[PDB]
Amino acid sequence: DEVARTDEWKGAGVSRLREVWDVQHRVRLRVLWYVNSFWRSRELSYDDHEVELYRALDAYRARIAVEYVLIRAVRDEIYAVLRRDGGALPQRFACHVSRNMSWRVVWELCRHALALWMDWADVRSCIIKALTPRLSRGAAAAAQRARRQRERSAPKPQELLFGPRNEPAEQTWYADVVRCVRAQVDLGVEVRAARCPRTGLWIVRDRRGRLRRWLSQPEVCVLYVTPDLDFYWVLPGGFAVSSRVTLHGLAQRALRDRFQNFEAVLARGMHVEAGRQEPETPRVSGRRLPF
Amino acid sequence: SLLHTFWRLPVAVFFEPHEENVLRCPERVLRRLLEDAAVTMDRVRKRYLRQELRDLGHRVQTYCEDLEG
Amino acid sequence: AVFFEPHEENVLRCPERVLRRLLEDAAVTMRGGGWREDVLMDRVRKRYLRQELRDLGHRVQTYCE
C-alpha cells in the first residue's frame, strides 16, 4: 500500500482556528493551522527580542510618517512663501471681484480654513494623488521628453515645409476643498484647468465643463496641485499662493513603499496587447451557479 | 485691508453665474461668517509613567513580603 | 453693484500687519506641538499596553490559582 500525501493532508484536518489583527486595529483575519503541514517538521525557534520590536516600531513610525511629514513640510512652505513675499500675495485665478467690500474678514476666514484643513489631513489628499502619476513607470521618460520638446530651436523654413509635421492647453490637476463655515473638509477631487485666453489667468472645471463655482463663495478655500509639483493655495477673490512642494526631507524608498503606482499583471479576459478596450470582469458572484 | 486693483474704473456686470464667479456679498453675511467661523474650533502621560514606577515599588515591596512570608 | 474684471497685476495687501503677525504667531505655536502622526502611534501604544496588561493579569491569575 502507498498512501498519497494529499490523502493524509485531507484526513489531517485543521488543529485550531486562530484569529489575529493588524497594527492599526482595523482588520481582523482568521488563520488556520494544519497538523500535517511541513511547518511542524522544520524544527525552528523563536527569538522575540525587545529592541528589535523597538526598531520595528521605529520603521513602522517612518512608514506611517511619510505622507504626514510631507504635509507638515507643505505647511512650512505655505508659511515661508507667505513671509518671503511680505504678505502681498498676487492674483493668479480669473474671478470677478469687488472693491467696496471689507477684506478684513476674508483673511481671517483663510487662516481658519488653513487651520481646519490641517485638522483634517488624510492619505486621500492633494499631494499624494499628484505624486502617483509621477511615480509611474514611464513618467520620467515622458517628463524628460517633454523637457526636450518644450526647448526647441527656431523653426527653419526647410523643416517647416518638407519635414515631418509637429504635434495641450488643458491640465488635469488635483484639489483639496475646505469648507470653512459648515466645517466639511472635502478631501480629494479631480479638476481640469485652462488658461482663459482673454487674460493670463486660470479657469477650473469638472469632467463635463461644469465651471466649478466655489471660488465665488467666501465660505470655502481650495488647494491645487499639478503633476509638475506646483502649489496653488486659493482663498476667495482669486488671489493665490504659488510655490513648489518639497521632497528633500523624504526618503526615496519611503515614497516607493508607501504609494507606488501599480503596473498591471496579465490575467483572464485581458488583452495581450495593452491600450485596448477590455471584455467583462470575471465577477464570480453569489447570483449565478458557477457554470 | 483694501486691495490694489490694476484697472482704475469699475466694470459693469450682467453675467449669469455659469459664466463667471463674483463676490457680491455684503458685510452682514460676512459678520455671520465670522460668528460661525470663530467659535467652530500632556503632563498626565509622564504622570502615568510615574504611577507605573510607583506600581514597580508596590510589586517589589510585595515581593519582599513574598521572600519574607 | 459694479465689479472688476481680473488681471495678474491686481493684488491684495498684507492686511495692515495685524493679522500677518497673528499668522506668524500661529506658525510658531504650531511649529512645536502636535505632529498628527504620533497620535495613531499613541493609539497602538495604548492598545499594546492594554493587551499586555490583560496578558499579565491573566498570567498571574492562572499561576495564582
Partner: peptide, 20 residues
Amino acid sequence: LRQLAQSVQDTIQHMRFLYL
C-alpha cells in the same frame, strides 16, 4: 518556592516599560 513567577514578572514588566 516562588522565585520564578515574580522574577519573570520583573522581566516582562521592564520589557513593558520599553514600549513608552
